[PDB]
Amino acid sequence: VKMMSLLEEMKGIYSKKGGKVKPFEKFEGELKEGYRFEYEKKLCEIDVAMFGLISGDLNPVHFDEDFASKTRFGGRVVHGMLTTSLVSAAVARLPGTVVLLEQSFRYTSPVRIGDVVRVEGVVSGVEKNRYTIDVKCYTGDKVVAEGVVKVLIW
Amino acid sequence: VKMMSLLEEMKGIYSKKGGKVKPFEKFEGELKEGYRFEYEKKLCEIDVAMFGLISGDLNPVHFDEDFASKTRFGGRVVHGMLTTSLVSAAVARLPGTVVLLEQSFRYTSPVRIGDVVRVEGVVSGVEKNRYTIDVKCYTGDKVVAEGVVKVLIW
């Protein structure tokens, strides 16, 4: 499989189905304790469908408008692990080669289909080349997830 | 957007590009302390490409064979949060309507493109309708991630 060709083909299909292609641009500055960054992306139907396919998570609460409307949520919600997948994208943009070591999140409020999710991170710890980062994910001013990740940076 | 039509279209494209469509079938039995379950799925190039598109995580270490071969990994690795996305799919299959509340994972060994990842879960805690589940993810006999999730079940 030629990955670069596959990605290019899928990018075209994704964009036609309403997906937002996020350019992969590294953040700037010296990484250190207190370093802050932010990253945001809209999560639309296509993102939810693709997440369901690749994970196998076809939970009706994320897909079936009528089913979800009868639940305590009163409508569909995006997978929590799709929301937090944006944190992977955010830390991947830090200077250097970044590898995820740990993640821990609590989901605080649902994300609805079409919502823009904003990740805000701050480096709270640096031990050798392992960076501990406090993270909150938002839709507008509302916290939708909060937690901590640790990454290795080469 | 008609989600059921979009999903169906994307399922066709996904399957043609090498993706494994996992049927969504609920697990059986009474949920309780000590309840065990398992779920597995292959993660191929298409899964990685789709995860990159929907998250915006286009980290070269997951995509560029030559770049990744020069790193300490000695070749591409699947996104850690793609590996653990299978845990969402696994808990979504528990009896009832399942909502993720918390997740925490440490990544222990890389997952390579094409690897089958197996999630093994066991309910360690039940408080009202909140279930705490110890989880390990494997490729063959090798632990690739370990942690805990909490879900709400209606």
User: What is the 3-state secondary structure of B51-89?
Assistant: HHHHHCCCCHHHHCHHHHHCCCCCCCCCCHHHHHHHHHH
CB distance A91 to A120 below 8 Å: no
CA distance B135 to B118: 10
**Interstrand relation of A116-127 and A130-139 (parallel, antiparallel or unpaired):** antiparallel
Buried (b) or exposed (e) across A24-62, using 16+ Cβ within 10 A?
eeebeeebeeebebebbbebbbbbbbbbbbbbbbbbebb
What is the DSSP secondary-structure string of A92-103?
Answer: HTSSS-EEEEEE
Q: How far is CA A111 from CA A74, A103, A144, B1, in A?
A: 12, 19, 7, 17
Give this entry's resolution in angstroms.
1.9
Structure letter (DSSP) for residue A43: -
Starting at the earlier edge strand, list the strands of the sheet with B98-107.
A36-42, A116-127, A130-139, A142-153, A98-107, B98-107, B142-153, B130-139, B116-127, B36-42
Across the interface, do A92 and B59 touch by the CB < 8 Å criterion? yes
What is the DSSP secondary-structure string of chain B?
Answer: --HHHHHHHHHHHHHHTT--PPP-----S---TT-EEEEEEE--HHHHHHHHHHH----HHHH-HHHHHTSTTSS----HHHHHHHHHHHHHTSSS-EEEEEEEEEE-S---TT-EEEEEEEEEEEETTEEEEEEEEEETTEEEEEEEEEEEE-
Report the Cα B66 to chain-centroid distance in Å: 26
CB distance A38 to A119 below 8 Å: yes
User: Hey, what are B122's tokens?
Assistant: 């066991």
* Chain A contacts in chain B segment 25-84 (CB below 8 A): 39, 41, 43-61, 63-65, 71-73, 77, 79-82, 84
Across the interface, do A98 and B59 touch by the CB < 8 Å criterion? yes
The answer to whether the Cα torsion of A60, A41, B136, B68 is positive or negative is positive
Structure letter (DSSP) for residue A109: S
Among candidates B94, B110, B78, which has minimal Cα distance to B150?
A: B94
Q: How was this structure determined?
A: X-ray
Q: What is the largest CA-CA distance in chain A?
A: 51
Among candidates B95, B94, B93, B139, which has minimal Cα distance to B119?
A: B139
CA distance B146 to B134: 8
Q: Which residues of B touch A73 (CB under 8 A)?
A: 99
Beta-carbon contacts of residue B106 (< 8 Å; ≥ 6 apart): A101, A102, B145, B146, B147
Partner residue facing B45 (CB), from A1, A72, A80: A1
CB distance B90 to B119 below 8 Å: yes
Across the interface, do B45 and A82 touch by the CB < 8 Å criterion? no
- Strand-pairing partners, residue A12, are none
Beta-carbon contacts of residue B93 (< 8 Å; ≥ 6 apart): B24, B25, B26, B27, B37, B39
Across the interface, do A45 and B86 touch by the CB < 8 Å criterion? no
* Chain A contacts in chain B segment 80-99 (CB below 8 A): 80-82, 84-89, 92, 97-99
Give, in degrees to the nearest 5, the angle at Cα B102 between B135 and B107.
45
CA distance A2 to B145: 28
CB distance B83 to B107 below 8 Å: yes
- The neighbour count for residue A114, using CB atoms within 10 Å, is 15
CB distance B54 to B84 below 8 Å: no
Partner residue facing B22 (CB), from A3, A56, A81: A56
CA distance B78 to A80: 20
Q: How far is CA B100 from CA A105, A109, A150, B9, B48, in A?
A: 10, 11, 21, 27, 23
| Token pair 């989600």 in the structure block, residue | B3
- The neighbour count for residue B81, using CB atoms within 10 Å, is 26
User: Hey, what are B23's tokens?
Assistant: 């049927």
- Domain residues of chain A, as ranges? 1-154
Best of A4, A42, A50 to disrupt the B interface (most B CBs within 10 Å) is A50
Would you tell me which CATH number, out of the four given (3.10.129.10, 3.40.1390.10, 3.30.1550.10, 3.90.740.10), belongs to the domain B1-154? 3.10.129.10
Across the interface, do B11 and A65 touch by the CB < 8 Å criterion? no
Q: How far is CA B35 from CA A69, B100, B105, in A?
A: 29, 17, 20
User: Hey, what are A150's tokens?
Assistant: 């640790």
Report the Cα B107 to chain-centroid distance in Å: 13
Across the interface, do A105 and B105 touch by the CB < 8 Å criterion? no
CB distance B151 to B98 below 8 Å: yes
CA distance B103 to A33: 25
Partner residue facing B56 (CB), from A41, A81, A84: A41
Structure letter (DSSP) for residue A18: T
Q: How far is B91 from chain A (nearest CA, A)?
A: 9
CA distance B1 to A111: 17
Across the interface, do B6 and A49 touch by the CB < 8 Å criterion? yes
Across the interface, do B56 and A89 touch by the CB < 8 Å criterion? yes
